[PDB]
């Protein structure tokens, strides 16, 4: 598989998260936090922490909602991971996807490539064994929330990556 930043590396607090996805999903949804972006390791770790910590300590979940989050600094972080249900696209979507979330606001800008890389990489492991369906489908979090993420520009690009279709 491509590298993944374990939780404990970015010094997450523990996940009190007891439901696990039943694998293979057959979708990924793709978002953005509309949050702060950073592009070192450093500053990225950190950012993984604010997220979590607003989903924790002021929305109340058992963990970080996203699967997985993706910095500019080209790195990607464990969120839930392959085996836990997410708290990312809704109720429905939750149980039937992995979220990946984009730390940024990619309204008027796209990720920087080491982003996109991480992100493409990440999910063709995803395909590679097993926890993603061979020819899953890629929606984006406005495909299936009501919301502007993943952002205008992030949006446009995804809807050419390979398995993207409709909606």
């Given at each position: 598989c491509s590298p993944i930043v374990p939780r404990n590396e970015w010094k997450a607090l523990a996940s009190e998260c007891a439901q696990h996805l039943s694998l293979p999903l057959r979708y990924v949804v793709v978002s953005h936090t509309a949050g702060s972006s950073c592009n070192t390791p450093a500053s990225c770790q950190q950012q993984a922490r604010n997220v979590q910590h607003?989903?924790?300590?002021?929305?109340?979940?058992?963990?970080?909602?996203?699967?997985?989050?993706?910095?500019?600094?080209?790195?990607?972080?464990?969120?839930?991971?392959?085996?836990?249900?997410?708290?990312?696209?809704?109720?429905?979507?939750?149980?039937?996807?992995?979220?990946?979330?984009?730390?940024?606001?990619?309204?008027?800008?796209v990720p920087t490539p080491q982003a996109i890389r991480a992100a493409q990489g990440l999910l063709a492991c995803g395909v590679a064994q097993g926890a993603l369906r061979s020819n899953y489908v890629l929606k984006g979090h406005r495909d299936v929330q009501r919301t502007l993420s993943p952002g205008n520009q992030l949006y446009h690009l995804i809807q050419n990556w390979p398995h993207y279709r409709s909606p």
């Open positions: 607003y989903h924790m300590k002021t929305l109340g979940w058992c963990d970080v909602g996203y699967n997985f989050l993706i910095g500019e600094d080209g790195l990607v972080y464990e969120g839930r991971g392959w085996n836990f249900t997410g708290a990312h696209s809704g109720h429905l979507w939750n149980p039937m996807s992995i979220g990946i979330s984009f730390m940024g606001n990619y309204m008027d800008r």
